[PDB]
Amino acid sequence: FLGFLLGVGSAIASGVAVCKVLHLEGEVNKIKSALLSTNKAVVSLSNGVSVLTFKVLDLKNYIDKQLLPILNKQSCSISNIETVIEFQQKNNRLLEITREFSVNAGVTTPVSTYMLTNSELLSLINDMPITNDQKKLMSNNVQIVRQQSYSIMCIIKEEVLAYVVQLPLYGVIDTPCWKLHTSPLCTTNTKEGSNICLTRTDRGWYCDNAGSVSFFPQAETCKVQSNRVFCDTMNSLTLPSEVNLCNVDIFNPKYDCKIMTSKTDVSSSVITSLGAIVSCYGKTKCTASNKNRGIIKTFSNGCDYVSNKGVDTVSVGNTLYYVNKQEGKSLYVKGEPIINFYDPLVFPSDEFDASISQVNEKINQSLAFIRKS
Amino acid sequence: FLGFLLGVGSAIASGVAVCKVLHLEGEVNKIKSALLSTNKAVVSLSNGVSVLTFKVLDLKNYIDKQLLPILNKQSCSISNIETVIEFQQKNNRLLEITREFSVNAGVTTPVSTYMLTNSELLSLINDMPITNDQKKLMSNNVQIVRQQSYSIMCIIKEEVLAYVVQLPLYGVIDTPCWKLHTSPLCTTNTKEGSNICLTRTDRGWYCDNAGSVSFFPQAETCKVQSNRVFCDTMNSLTLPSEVNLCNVDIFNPKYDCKIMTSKTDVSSSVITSLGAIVSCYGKTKCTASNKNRGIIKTFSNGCDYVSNKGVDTVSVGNTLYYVNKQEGKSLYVKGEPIINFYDPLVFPSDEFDASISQVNEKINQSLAFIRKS
Amino acid sequence: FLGFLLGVGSAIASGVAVCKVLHLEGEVNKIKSALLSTNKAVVSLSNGVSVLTFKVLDLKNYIDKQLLPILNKQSCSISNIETVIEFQQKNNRLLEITREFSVNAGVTTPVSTYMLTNSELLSLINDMPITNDQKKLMSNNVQIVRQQSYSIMCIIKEEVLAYVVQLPLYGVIDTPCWKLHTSPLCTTNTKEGSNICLTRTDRGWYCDNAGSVSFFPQAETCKVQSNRVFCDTMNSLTLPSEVNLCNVDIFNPKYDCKIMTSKTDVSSSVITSLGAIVSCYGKTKCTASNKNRGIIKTFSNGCDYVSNKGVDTVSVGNTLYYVNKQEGKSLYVKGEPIINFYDPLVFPSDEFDASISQVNEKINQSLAFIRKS
Amino acid sequence: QNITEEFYQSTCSAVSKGYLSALRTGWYTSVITIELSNIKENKCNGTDAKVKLIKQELDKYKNAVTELQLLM
Amino acid sequence: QNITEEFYQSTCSAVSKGYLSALRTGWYTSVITIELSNIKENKCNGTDAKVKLIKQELDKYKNAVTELQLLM
Amino acid sequence: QNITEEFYQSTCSAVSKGYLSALRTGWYTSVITIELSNIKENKCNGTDAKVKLIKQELDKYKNAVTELQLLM
């Protein structure tokens, strides 16, 4: 819910910069001369930055030394038809690259096999100026690399087509991460109104980074392979470590945990990594079921939780939820719901982006106003 | 605007569960022995659920009994070229599946023809644990089925490639649905400020479901056929039927209609199923026009509505809107705008997610606060 | 931040209307007779509107006068395999169009090369009822045209398959535009709390249009060429021109600039067209660096700005930002931060969508409340 | 020139002037047709391999047309 | 008849009745298999061009199998 | 050890620990080229079927090159 606090930045600024440096008079001939010998070479660009350069497809060689010599020599009628298919190969790639650039306005999100093959991508990763740990990580997760990289069509001139493949740089690796799931926490009185609801808004991913915590509010922009969380530092805030205290105690004086207040008595289900949170309010049907034995639990009104062990389905009203069957150990920290600490008549019925201290200050203000009489 | 109230859930949890059970030592030989006879078979998985299994492509048979026998027998030169094309067929599917899984990180959001053909998809639908009406509905809208289903690449070992195609289940069918469109309702006083705006926030789809109403706030995540509304119960709240009273009268005591208050005097247009609502405030030009007659109506300040009969275009300021020219009957329920019922000095100048009763209670509180002096 | 103020509208209403007009008795025979002579013709539809019509692929001619004569002559024995490939050509386009429509449920959001080739699209643009400037603009940026246009599958009958390609019009051209970037502006006192933050919410694009200003809050839904800004008037609000005064003076009485108040002391970076704004608060490390010389600036606490000349990278905490290397002139307007004009005890700690007059007036409210005791 | 940018430290905000407009403002529809053939079901001996390939291509074509008819 | 619509000027809101439901109530998983071949490094004389084409296709197949194995 | 999860009924929220980080701290650009040919686009007899097919393929290639040129 904290996506508006993030700063905005240009994602393809580096690739576009390399392109603008690639338009200089004599830079395409530089790259072509460098790749005249082999299919890959390090080239110092006119801006000073040294980039790796790949020749992934050679059509001038094939066209000018294998197809046109046999075609327009004498008796232009050709004797073998395997040349037609051999030319349909090695040319589909150019057509598909052209079409991908046409439909994606010249810069394509995840980098396809047509843009860059797995052998070429691994060869590019292995020859990068990074530590061996990042090389191993990138080589094992080539799919996440493709998802997190761009390909900007750069220039086409001097018989050469150029595009910049802008790959991620996984500088921070192997630090502990944790996901935070939240759900509305309301009172369970039978009255139609006067039912106050409180929720935590700091949901999303958190990772240790240089003594601080990189927090990602839009958890949708974070991929998970096995237990590794690939995130983008640009879609993130940077917070002190004390924010983690919000889990051991939400009233601690060090960090102020952002919350949200409302009066909407809505039953919901939030599926976590290993289990499910169920906020069952009103006359709604809340059910936990196993695939082979049917319904095994009926939820009482309030905020409850079940583990993914033995539970395969969570039903809330008409919504059906399949729980993640990932293995692990779950823990239930018993405690009294915080919502039982406030007065329903003095509680701020609506505040989108607030915190514990802010709500407490408004409560202090209203109580000081009331006490004067 | 109520997209934040719904709960979050894992979409491919079922497919991921079926994958995790296929990684057990064995379980692949089970499927292989079951498919040893035919190309389709029901297999009891080690987790107990019995799943249907298809062998959509036989490459071991073709490679090892039709191509390699003729190649590595003697005289490796082949005499016919139709074998080359016959091998380009029946192999494009595997390559395309591999590439789709590589670019999409192993899970594709629309199920392509390469993953599952229409004949195979219809055969899978017809052998599903659903009623014949649901079978007919899925068979007539195979494209919407492909749009609402996933395909998770599962495992590749023991000379077998496996992926789980996770299809939607249309349990609720033929129940009446209705969409609710809303627009800001402001006052039309001549002052530049002090202009209060009120809006209904319950916009979206509503469908009868098990005596309750499944409500979908993000109507953009719902596809529409001729008059059939395909939605996902996971992107939905479950409400009592009395919410419908919010249409016949918004002040009824049974249900409390969620609203929103603001002070932003912005002219807007909301195009409905058959017609257009125009909230024309400020000094903005609001126009209703026919294709062949030009401007045919000028809107006065306030919230007005026009039918799609005779009106083909709605202009607000510089924005042009084409109205849906679909057949139907429109009705204009005359009534006084609700915004004229509140005092501008007691009106909450900013409240995103509120209701009628909440606004009335805050008015009572503020009036008691003012009266104390 | 003002993306919620926009109205909703049907995007493909015009194409769907032309489709509903194509189902009338005789309209497809009309189009076929018009295209009987050439491959392009202007047709006056029964709806009054005159549309351009293209015959992009002729298979009936080829199949019925080049394939069926040779196939079913004596015993369908074929003598040459080049016929197979010649039929794989001229047929791939129909299959790809079918696949594109099947996966997208009949309406595709970017118009691909399969739907309409670049030659056909340019031929269609050049014969449109638009001025020569609009023709030149559309012809130079065909990729942006494809990105902002639809293709609605319309009808298939009378041996003809028809789909309507719904192209943009670009009515407003060459008028001056400007982008507005915003960043949080907080105080820099050393206390952990009591630190007020102010931000501008009117970020996004602005263009002059018919004496008014078309404002686009979702600047991500605007493509940018060299210096041309392609936006959609539907993703826009319409404001008076006086809004531009919010740049020359933010306390002017004519227009009221919408702002946002908070108390979140979070360091952020906002990259603009030609430089970067850095809001460095707390104990966060904020750095400006050149590619070849390393760190060249350390930011003090507050809101500062750097130009893209000599600065290639901005680091905030653990987040790295690459600056756009686009050519231009930057200017630094020195002035006192507005946040130093308010009392921290009277400042509204939370208001998402507010304005200068609203926040300033609420300050009067709270000050009158405090002074009464 | 061609592009300028001003940073107001007063309100911590930047303005980027010098761009030109291309606003949609409307639509233009255009009917695009593809002439099809309703080839009648053949009946001949599928003994050749190239004839089998042509039969497969005809099946692909007819199935595409059938999906398109069935897509309404 | 089919579709109707009512506009309430009271609350400035429209309701569109007459539609029918097709709601995703659940999921159905299905395992789909492809039987593969373990080419054990073939070796034959590359004198023909068609044999070169078949070898290129075999290379494509083996590279596909290896790529599928590498996403684990 | 492995992934663990704790559910706090106090604040109605769950935390899932045990994951590892791989953060995009930066970018690495790399120029990738495809060498094209300026083939002389004419002069052969379109009498043969194989030659006509090769000429159509050359048309496809040059139209691709032209489309790429139009991406500026």
Ligand SMILES: *[C@@H]1O[C@H](CO)[C@@H](O)[C@H](O)[C@H]1NC(C)=O
């Ligand atoms: C705030 O201060 C005084 C009220 O006595 C007045 O001069 C000023 O106009 C007020 N501004 C408001 C109410 O916006």
